[PDB]
Amino acid sequence: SVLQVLHIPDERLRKVAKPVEEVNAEIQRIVDDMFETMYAEEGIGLAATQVDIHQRIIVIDVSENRDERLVLINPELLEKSGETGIEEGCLSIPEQRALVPRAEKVKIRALDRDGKPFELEADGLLAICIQHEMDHLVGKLFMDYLSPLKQQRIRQKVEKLDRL
Numbered sequence: 001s002v003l004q005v006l007h008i009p010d011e012r013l014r015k016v017a018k019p020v021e022e023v024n025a026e027i028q029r030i031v032d033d034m035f036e037t038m039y040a041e042e043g044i045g046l047a048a049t050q051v052d053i054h055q056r057i058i059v060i061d062v063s064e065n066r067d068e069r070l071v072l073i074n075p076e077l078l079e080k081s082g083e084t085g086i087e088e089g090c091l092s093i094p095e096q097r098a099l100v101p102r103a104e105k106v107k108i109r110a111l112d113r114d115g116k117p118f119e120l121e122a123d124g125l126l127a128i129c130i131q132h133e134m135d136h137l138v139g140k141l142f143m144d145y146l147s148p149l150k151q152q153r154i155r156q157k158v159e160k161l162d163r164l
Ligand SMILES: [Zn+2]
Pocket: 089, 090, 091, 092, 132, 136
């Protein structure tokens, strides 16, 4: 149920996920386990690469009451616009936060948990979270937008924390 979330510097976090070939009962089980992991870790999104599953699967819920489940299988970014940024954290980079430039608005297509295609226009927090999770699927972390020295400071603090 609660899968293991990988933390930097694990090279598995740099792996590029393959597309899901068929949305079947196995894929639906992965989706459900990813939500259970996400909520147990108090996250608002989770990408399959963070749990060592090399498939293009994202789960998101930005709601306070944890009752608004968004599933993005094989997501495609169609359009983006504007610029914004907030202090982002990442379950794979424990206890670190930094402001990251992001598009303010995104338009995406994906498959839902039933395999049905849909299109979503998002802004604000949801748009930011979508970009953060899509980055995970191509081996990209928010710290990659930062300077090399800030990246090394992040890497050493996470390592300190993990060595406990
Ligand atoms: Zn993350």
